[PDB]
Structure 1
Amino acid sequence: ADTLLILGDSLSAGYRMSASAAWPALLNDKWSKTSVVNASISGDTSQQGLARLPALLKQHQPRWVLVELGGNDGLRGFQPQQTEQTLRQILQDVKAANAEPLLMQIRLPANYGRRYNEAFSAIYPKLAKEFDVPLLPFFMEEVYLKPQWMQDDGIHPNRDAQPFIADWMAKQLQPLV
């Protein structure tokens, strides 16, 4: 069975819930076929993800790698420039491992910076075009439209939202896998 590696942060690992309750675990159940490995850690910056990548690649030898990182950057100490570079290497390492990189668009809260958001957001379309890889939409956009699927912090999706996200991701990944 082929393997889809998910390299992400709390949006994929789940925030304040077990990984078994997070959408990647639900997606794996929907798929006695494609194997989904959730290598996501709440709080991980794009750099912390890149540091774990080497071992993950040579350990799971995945055909596809879903990169969902960057959202934490801007809280720890990096700029769009650094974030862009970090993600750039991740894509390179994935390609070098004969795996297909799948980049997910990330967006920050309206209250994070006037033009800072535009600079951060632009990073994804640029890299996607630079490496010519699929650029998935930010799944949280649909979740924000449903308050009942959001946690008190208005940032992370709750338990009730995971099934919807798993189905949404299945639909987006279907053509890619």
Structure 2
Amino acid sequence: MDTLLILGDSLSAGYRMSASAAWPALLNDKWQSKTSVVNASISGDTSQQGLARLPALLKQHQPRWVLVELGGNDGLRGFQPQQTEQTLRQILQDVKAANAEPLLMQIRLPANYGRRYNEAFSAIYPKLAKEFDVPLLPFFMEEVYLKPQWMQDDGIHPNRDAQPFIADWMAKQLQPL
């Protein structure tokens, strides 16, 4: 079996829920005996904190692909987009140099954040996917935001009931990869 490594923040770890409640556990169950899914996600992680954890994970897991789901905390904290871009660039360099295929997820801030900064933050992702010639996955939360029954009260993080949707959505996005 090949291994999919997830390098993520609470959108993949689960916000205020157990790891086993989060969609990557559901995906792992769905892909039993075919593909291993390692959820190396930490609630609250910046792109810099993800990057710090990455080398040990690459060594240990020798994954075939790495899903990079990071930078949203940087954006939510108003960090400079150029800085989050460089950090993400380093993550992508590390992945390729370990002989793994990076899969970069587009991240955005919710629709009530100011539009100029959200635009500059969001733009980093297609720029990096083009630069590294890697898949750019769409942001799964854009669908989730549209369902109050799947959102926690902060308007940011998906709830436990959203997790089976997200797992199914991710299974569908990831099969041609």
TM-score of the pair, normalised by structure 1: 0.96
Q: Kindly state the Cα deviation for residue 83 of structure 1 after the two structures are TM-superposed.
A: 0.3
Gaps of 5+ in 2: none
Deviations 1:105-154 (A, max 9, x none): 00012343331111101000000000000000000011111110111111
TM-score of the pair, normalised by structure 2: 0.96
Distance 1:115 1:152 in 2: 25
Number of residue pairs the alignment of both structures matches: 175
For residue 44 of structure 2, give the secondary structure of its aligned residue in structure 1.
coil
* Identity among equivalent pairs (%): 100
The CA RMSD over aligned residues, in Å, is 1.0
Deviations 1:37-69 (A, max 9, x none): 000000000000000000000010000000000
Q: Which moved more, 1:70-79 or 1:94-103?
A: 70-79
Gaps of 5+ in 1: none
Distance 2:63 2:126 in 1: 24
Distance 1:69 1:50 in 2: 9
For residue 99 of structure 2, give the secondary structure of its aligned residue in structure 1.
coil
Q: Kindly state the Cα deviation for residue 14 of structure 1 after the two structures are TM-superposed.
A: 0.2
Q: Which moved more, 1:75-84 or 1:131-140?
A: 75-84
Q: Which runs of 4+ in 1 moved over 3 A?
A: 74-77
CA contact (8 A) 2:71 2:107 kept: yes
